[PDB]
Amino acid sequence: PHSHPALTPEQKKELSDIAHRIVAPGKGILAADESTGSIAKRLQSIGTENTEENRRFYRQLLLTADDRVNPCIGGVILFHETLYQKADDGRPFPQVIKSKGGVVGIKVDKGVVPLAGTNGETTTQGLDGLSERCAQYKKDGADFAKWRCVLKIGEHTPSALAIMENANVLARYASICQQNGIVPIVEPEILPDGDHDLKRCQYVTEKVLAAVYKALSDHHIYLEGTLLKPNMVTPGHACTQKYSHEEIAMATVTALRRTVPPAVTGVTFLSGGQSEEEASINLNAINKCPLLKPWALTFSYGRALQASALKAWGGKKENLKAAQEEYVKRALANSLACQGKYTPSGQAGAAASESLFISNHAY
Amino acid sequence: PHSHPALTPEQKKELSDIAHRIVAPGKGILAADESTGSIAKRLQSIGTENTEENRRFYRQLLLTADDRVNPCIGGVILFHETLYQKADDGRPFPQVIKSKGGVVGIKVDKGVVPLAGTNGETTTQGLDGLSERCAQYKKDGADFAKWRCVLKIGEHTPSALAIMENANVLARYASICQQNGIVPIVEPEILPDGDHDLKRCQYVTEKVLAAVYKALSDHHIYLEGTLLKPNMVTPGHACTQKYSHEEIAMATVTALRRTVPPAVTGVTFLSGGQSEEEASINLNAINKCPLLKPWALTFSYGRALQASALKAWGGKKENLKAAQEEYVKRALANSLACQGKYTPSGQAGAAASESLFISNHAY
Amino acid sequence: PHSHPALTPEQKKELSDIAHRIVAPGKGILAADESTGSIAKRLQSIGTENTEENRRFYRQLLLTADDRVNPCIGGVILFHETLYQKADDGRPFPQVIKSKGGVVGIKVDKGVVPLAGTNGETTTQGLDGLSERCAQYKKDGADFAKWRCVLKIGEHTPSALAIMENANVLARYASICQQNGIVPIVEPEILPDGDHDLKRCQYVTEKVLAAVYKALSDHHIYLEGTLLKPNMVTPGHACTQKYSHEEIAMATVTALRRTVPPAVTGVTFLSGGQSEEEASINLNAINKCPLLKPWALTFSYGRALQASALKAWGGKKENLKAAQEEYVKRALANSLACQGKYTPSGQAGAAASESLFISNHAY
Amino acid sequence: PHSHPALTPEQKKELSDIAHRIVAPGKGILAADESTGSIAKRLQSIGTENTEENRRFYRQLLLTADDRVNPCIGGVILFHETLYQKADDGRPFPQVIKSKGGVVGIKVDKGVVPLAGTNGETTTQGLDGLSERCAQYKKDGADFAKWRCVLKIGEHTPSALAIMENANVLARYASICQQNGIVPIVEPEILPDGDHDLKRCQYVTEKVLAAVYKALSDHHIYLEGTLLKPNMVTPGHACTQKYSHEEIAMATVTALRRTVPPAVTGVTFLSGGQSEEEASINLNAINKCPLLKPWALTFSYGRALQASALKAWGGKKENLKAAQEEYVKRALANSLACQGKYTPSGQAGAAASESLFISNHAY
Ligand SMILES: O=P(O)(O)OC[C@@H](O)[C@@H](O)[C@H](O)[C@H](O)COP(=O)(O)O
Ligand SMILES: O=P(O)(O)OC[C@@H](O)[C@@H](O)[C@H](O)[C@H](O)COP(=O)(O)O
Numbered sequence A, B, C, D: 001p002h003s004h005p006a007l008t009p010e011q012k013k014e015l016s017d018i019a020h021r022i023v024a025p026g027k028g029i030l031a032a033d034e035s036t037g038s039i040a041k042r043l044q045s046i047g048t049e050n051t052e053e054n055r056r057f058y059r060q061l062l063l064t065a066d067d068r069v070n071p072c073i074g075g076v077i078l079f080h081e082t083l084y085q086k087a088d089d090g091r092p093f094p095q096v097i098k099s100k101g102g103v104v105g106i107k108v109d110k111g112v113v114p115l116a117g118t119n120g121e122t123t124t125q126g127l128d129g130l131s132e133r134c135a136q137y138k139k140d141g142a143d144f145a146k147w148r149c150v151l152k153i154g155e156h157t158p159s160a161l162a163i164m165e166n167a168n169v170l171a172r173y174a175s176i177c178q179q180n181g182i183v184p185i186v187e188p189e190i191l192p193d194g195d196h197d198l199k200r201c202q203y204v205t206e207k208v209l210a211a212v213y214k215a216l217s218d219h220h221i222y223l224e225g226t227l228l229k230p231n232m233v234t235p236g237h238a239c240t241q242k243y244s245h246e247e248i249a250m251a252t253v254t255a256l257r258r259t260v261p262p263a264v265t266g267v268t269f270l271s272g273g274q275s276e277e278e279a280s281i282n283l284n285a286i287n288k289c290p291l292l293k294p295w296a297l298t299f300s301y302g303r304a305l306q307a308s309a310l311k312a313w314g315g316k317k318e319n320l321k322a323a324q325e326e327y328v329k330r331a332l333a334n335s336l337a338c339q340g341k342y343t344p345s346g347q348a349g350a351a352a353s354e355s356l357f358i359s360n361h362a363y
């Protein structure tokens, strides 16, 4: 009979197998995909000129940390330039990543662009020629990709248009990726900017994710062959009201349970500005939340895995080891965190629970 | 938007507790909500006059079955008439149901109506004065409701309009119910009529459910305070190709995992014309399907729980006891099935977890 | 995704012929469809008891005005009760209306109901059994109907949900009407309540009408067989900034030109609280607006045609003539207005300039 | 309350003024924007090598036709390459166009791309860096742009996804253009391929356009600053039923009246494979259609203005004069057609004194 499925069972198996590898138990993602202009600001914060060699050295610094990170890193997201650079031993970075047990990912969006008629809202571009790009990236060692849409909570934002448009472009991106054997990481980041409280973020997150999945369905996206990279549900950066990690965890898990189909292979949280410690603690609380979570809940951190490393390096080659040690430190912390076994202190623990605390209908 | 939550933490807790009671481990729902017109067909099928007394006697037959059904029945759906009838001992049927540990339910839709401009498609009516009806039903013993929408698989159905409209009306229905302390069972039934295959039914079910949940989100429905009543995923009635129960189970569970948020408290399958044994076996296979299932997967059967009871009764007072044994038998069978413990032996349960080496990428 | 003719060519002609008849040059609509509870309030503003006879007498007063109203009134909307009432001469009100060359219309909605999760927003009920009601109304003399949805401008309103839902139910209402030979007047009223300015009302009116027509399209509605009853575009009742009639006319015609397809037979403005004189003057400025207007632009007034009459009557039968004279005054004025030939009289100003605005909140 | 206007009054004025200039009475558009690959097909049909010089000479040939085309061409669409080429006299082609009273247009889409999971349907790419491209084009002489989406009528096409996606990307393209002072020509072309009949094409065209305008509204598009470039409503190429030009005209105008807001400045039909004569005769019948049309109905022809000229040229510079004469004849023909004054094989006549309103409802 008449039938035109988007993928064959062979294409589905390849995508599903890749997605599961990335978020296998205890593993997370290192998001080191900052574009030229963005990494330039990072290097600037430590008085380091933004040359290709310094970008190569910094990326090599993270990608070649010792084997203690192997069990912690299921994947590494790179920016185009880096995907084609090499370590001092002549090995292309994709080979270095793979030799350490990681799956190579490539950021494919081309930045945000303003949505006319909105209060400073944006959508994301990068769809032009994406299919050919994906085909080339695949041949060059990449198995997954990343695309970032940005939404903001404000007076009249996110608006209906911004929500619908961003969800739609994510679906287009995901569709093209899957046609090329690349697992798409869908990143609809809701910024923490503003003074909104926890319930407001949870509400917006629920509305945004519902839109994202309806769009993924309309575009015939194979969910088992994807990963979701959302913001955790937290109060606004300037929210006067304060909250505990357990509340943040409850709000986040609740929002996800109400919008993310169990078919989605994994949820890899962005750190969104949270300190390295805060990001690890919250991820740990999320994994210890009493609710049933049918998908891996791990990390895809940029700042939360590089903050201390960048600083320790200071743009000086003699600080290589010390810098790598800071990164390992966070890779190890978050690996435990995505399993709910993180105790902020040293590395050893004992107990891990929070009995006598129910009633979560306040969410 | 983002103005005034639909439910307080108190209302949420009430709706959630009710929903969970209905689908507690080993429990399912008896769907005896046939309207006067539909019950006439059943009675006529056994040479029995369609009088209010015969309807009462029949419903009494099912509701007063012995204590063996107590742990099997978490809820009972009734038609308006029956909610206000009494057993021979003078006890209102709702009291009879509650005394056996069941939650009382009430059907609130007013039948299907044709959608102009479509190929024989419909939407369902019954929203007028629904809030008032719900407040009254709640007061009179009902804690949940049921609303049925009907869709068909055909050359050009379900159409975009049918999918959209039915999803929207279901959302309106659920919203009104939740404002009145009533748990809404959302029933988007896709008829098994036609010669379409299993893959086609899975496809359509996936599209329908994605639409159903997007609408529930748009209407601010509290998912934890709802239940889903969908068709299992099966080939069309006239489909020549044959499938196994494992294939029906796999297709069904896959469809649900790709569309139903984990927040949904439970899925209560309609039997849709399957024989009593067929409905029990598929339900059992569904619960044995190796994939992760974040919600209760049980029954809300009408024909699958009454077929043999109705036949044995035959409208004859003398067959009351024989008729009840037939109903109890199915009640016990499905109770085991919703736990994946149904074997033709009965209480014994050694044969389980059969096979394992399989591929779900074919779905 | 093919075409399944909702209407035959014969049905289309009937609906189109009716629509054009109602808004023929120089003609408008008398909206006397206030329900028992709404009319009761009008009778209390004149110390008149709300009795069936008083409602009948009042309706007879308007409907039996001298022949001067014949060229002015293309149609009259009635409430259910009045449709089956008779004049002192024994003639059913529909026969009376028809003998004066007017088309009989029937209000069929059942009032607004609250949308949970919104900031005091509503949708409208009345679809249940609407097909049968329309069939009977048709046999009893009615050729068109009216259904009112209510939207409010404020902080966060109209919400995406309120706009979507109200547009969809209007579409359902219109579909059922056309299946029974009744022309549906689609009324998506955006209340004037608030301190918003002209451009804000224009903005919201454009978004609302865009939604209304997309919905009408999705439901396969025959536009030539419909009429639109919108609010004129004006500043909020509490706006400080003042505007001329030319500006109001410009904003109104512009919003309409940007959303209403030329196929729509006519636009019949509701007066929404404006005084009899203001409503006429604005309708006149609208028809004088230089921009191309592909549809008839006339009136369908309730308050703006009854203000002075209800007053002159005072429930005292002796004031029959005086009261009827005030009604004729406004019909003639509006008849000229919808032709762009009205210049104020300056005679009857006892209640023709009074603000007929009414607070809107709660039930 | 800000509404966040996408455009200021001056920006609107500029776009509106440009749109009206292109479709001024008696004027149409020459679509000579064939990309390198497409123009290759045209040149190969006449045994000519596809070199830049040959393309430059051919475009020069059209752009430099004598002054007789001046009153006929309100705008000329160019492909990027041609926008920066010069005539033999050293004048930039844009300068040539403007010196003859024409507005310069630029095609900005980057071709169609397959939509995964559909039956050979596509969407269009080209949004990446479009803002900067539009700013550059504006500075270099262009005042309007063109973007083509392609949909097809088939057993299951256009699908809901195809319609939704194409309408959305058209809205994004239109939004970016208007932000840069460029008038966007929205071209949602429904191919004539297939054996579907006239009513079928009319149905799909109505649905596609309704989707297009809802999307434009959602994206805050200033309609008075746009032009619509749709297919005329005709039977599929393989349709065995025959229709008159009057029938084609009725269906076309009817479809447009039911979906295109009067605010739209103009409708510029694509020829879509029709012969030069057919395209002219149909455009003429459309302009003579008795129904009310609130927008200019003219041409934006590619093949219908070049067929004979391309053939007469044959890649031989010695055929310049002959080639140009064929183009001049077609420009004159369509200029008359967009005024409803075209008569092939007998350019002579004088009538038109009545109007009336009769027609039928078979559309
Ligand atoms: O400025 P660019 O070139 O667009 O790069 C953006 C990129 O860094 C982000 O999308 C991160 O991959 C992701 O959001 C996690 O980052 P954190 O929020 O954990 O730091
Ligand atoms: O004809 P009516 O008055 O509308 O009643 C319909 C009602 O019986 C059904 O909705 C069942 O509750 C449900 O679909 C399970 O039925 P089964 O498919 O298991 O027989």
Ligand SMILES: O=P(O)(O)OC[C@@H](O)[C@@H](O)[C@H](O)[C@H](O)COP(=O)(O)O
Binding pocket: C031, C033, C034, C035, C036, C038, C077, C111, C146, C148, C189, C269, C270, C271, C272, C273, C300, C301, C302, C303, C304
């Ligand atoms: O209170 P009910 O029973 O729902 O009746 C409502 C009805 O009067 C209105 O819908 C008018 O037909 C229309 O809005 C024009 O009224 P004006 O705005 O011209 O006064």
Ligand SMILES: O=P(O)(O)OC[C@@H](O)[C@@H](O)[C@H](O)[C@H](O)COP(=O)(O)O
Binding pocket: D031, D032, D033, D034, D035, D036, D037, D038, D039, D077, D111, D146, D148, D189, D269, D270, D271, D272, D273, D300, D301, D302, D303, D304
């Ligand atoms: O193949 P490309 O390089 O994408 O170019 C397409 C371009 O020729 C068309 O979009 C015309 O501007 C328009 O559709 C009218 O063409 P006709 O239908 O009148 O021939």
